[PDB]
Structure 1
Amino acid sequence: GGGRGRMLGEMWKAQLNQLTRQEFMEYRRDGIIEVDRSAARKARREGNVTGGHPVSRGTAKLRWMVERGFVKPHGKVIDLGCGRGGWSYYCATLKLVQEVKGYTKGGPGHEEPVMMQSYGWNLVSLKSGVDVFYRPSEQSDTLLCDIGEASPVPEIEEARTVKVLQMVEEWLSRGVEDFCVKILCPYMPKVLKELEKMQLRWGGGLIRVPLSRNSNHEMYWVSGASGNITNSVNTVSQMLINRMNRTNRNGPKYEEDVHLGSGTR
């Protein structure tokens, strides 16, 4: 019905929605870790596919979790919503990974897989024109999913996140041992309910990647994490609201992007 208690994240969202463009502009990257993408923009302008520049900021995002042991890509990796291929190409550089298969929607308003020759590119298959929500599940050892379309209405993000979770349940049952699944809106009620069930069935925990922008509450359900989900989410909302109410902003902390090298494996 209506009149239910609200989570601390719902008010971060309501607050965010009442920010001016200027406040939004100054807040979204204040205090976050940001990768220097200048060289990657030149490599893109020049069609340089052997310089080791990732196709997106998603690569550095996944490296952060992998280097910290939150997810151990290995064997056969499937990448639902691969977009340009940032996660897929990064995984192909890992020793334990044997094969990477990426699926992405593509078309109008959606990113297309990019052809690159980063290290291990021969192990990467990226397919556009695949709506993962209608694809029958396949066997894999590592399941990755980064699908989360933002919206100003939390009820819309909520229904979208539950959709993603119900879908990965089909793929997790095909022998997956390691996973990393994006949770676009982890503070909504129907999401916390589905997440609690999903954690019970498959383990893992919710982490926040500091390279994420303050303009979103997205978190990642990774098999290498653990802990009460509510506390995990609330810690993030608390962090986000402290950053929103700052006046003196420091801007992002810049660090160097991932280098993917080149050559076949």
Structure 2
Amino acid sequence: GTGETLGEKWKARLNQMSALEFYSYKKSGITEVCREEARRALKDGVATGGHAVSRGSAKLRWLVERGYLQPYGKVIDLGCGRGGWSYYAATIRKVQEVKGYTKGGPGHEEPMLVQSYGWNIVRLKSGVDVFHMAAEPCDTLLCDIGESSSSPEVEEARTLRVLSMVGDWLEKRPGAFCIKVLCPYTSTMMETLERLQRRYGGGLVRVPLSRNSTHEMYWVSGAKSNTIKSVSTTSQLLLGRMDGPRRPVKYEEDVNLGSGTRAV
């Protein structure tokens, strides 16, 4: 083999940054949705204003509007948290049912109950560890699990744990999927992702709403990405942002998910 990858170099540089450098680096040049209004409304109990429950709805919007993902049918959302991906999925015409599962509890996000469009086809279940749930068939499989660590070895071990669990769900044959890959950047991870692409298809995409402090990419059924090239391009973007001036954030309006129930 050839030793340290570009993403491993990125992680080592990230760990050596001072806190002041990290503070400016983490958002340099990223895209960000404005959330102050949504958070205030949600704090006020507004359920019909179209507000997204988290920044996650915008991440899924980015993938869907570009054709990386075409959700349909029964959607299962593993690690749904407050529900940003589940509520976004429920607004999509071809989606018919959304079931989110999340752990909840101290230090973890609980599902939030709002009345964005299609809320009546969404069921969010807390108190569920998806690593100990039997996999079920679905049409679209979503998973946004993976806890960051300063150790790249820990990030790799955590990502392999996520992907092994997701493989049990992929074996039930959904036609669409979107899976967070916390660590795509070690040699073991790139080999694993190539194997997974051969069996299940799809490819990796970097969402520009991700912060520069994580190398996360999304494995989606509609990408046709060379694993090594897509990971390397992302490592180069993240490394390049470690040099030179702070780049401005590209602010965007957050997703508005509307209101009202869906008919059947």
TM-superposition CA deviations, 1:165-211 (whole Å, max 9, x none): 11111001112000000000100222222211110001100000001
Asked if the contact 1:83/1:110 (under 8 Å) is kept, the reply is yes
Question: Could you say which residue in structure 1 is the equivalent of 2:256?
Answer: 259
Match of 1:195 among 193, 215, 236: 193
After TM superposition, what 4+ stretches of structure 1 lie above 6 angstroms from structure 2? none
Are 2:237 and 1:239 aligned?
Answer: yes
Find the counterpart in structure 2 of residue 108 from structure 1: 106
Q: Secondary structure at the match of 2:241?
A: helix
Q: CA–CA distance in 2 between the matches of 1:43 and 1:189?
A: 45
Give runs of aligned pairs for residues 206-217 of structure 1, distance below 5 A.
206-217=204-215
- Counterpart-to-counterpart distance in 2, 1:19 and 1:227: 31
1:250, 1:236 → 2: CA distance?
17
Letter in 2 for 1:258: V
Per the alignment, residue 166 of structure 1 pairs with 164
Query: What root-mean-square deviation, in Å, do the aligned CA atoms of Structure 1 and Structure 2 show?
Result: 1.0
Structure 1 residue corresponding to 2:82, chosen from 72, 81, 84: 84
How many equivalent pairs are there? Answer: 262
Conserved in 2, the CA contact under 8 Å of 1:107 and 1:129?
yes
The corresponding residue for 2:116 is 118
State the TM-score, normalized to the length of structure 2. 0.97
Name structure 2 gaps, 5 residues minimum: none
Q: Given that residues 88 and 102 in structure 1 are in contact (C-alpha distance below 8 angstroms), is that contact kept between their aligned partners in structure 2? A: yes
Contact 1:162–1:190 (CA<8 Å) still a contact in 2? no
SS of 1:15 mapped into structure 2: helix
Deviates more, 1:187-196 or 1:88-97: 187-196
Aligned runs of 1:2-151 on 2, under 5 Å? 5-151=3-149
User: What is the letter of the counterpart of residue 260 of structure 1?
Assistant: L
Task: Give the drift of 1:4.
Answer: 6.2
Distance apart, 1:39 and its partner CA: 1.1
Alignment of 1:169-188 (within 5 A): 169-188=167-186
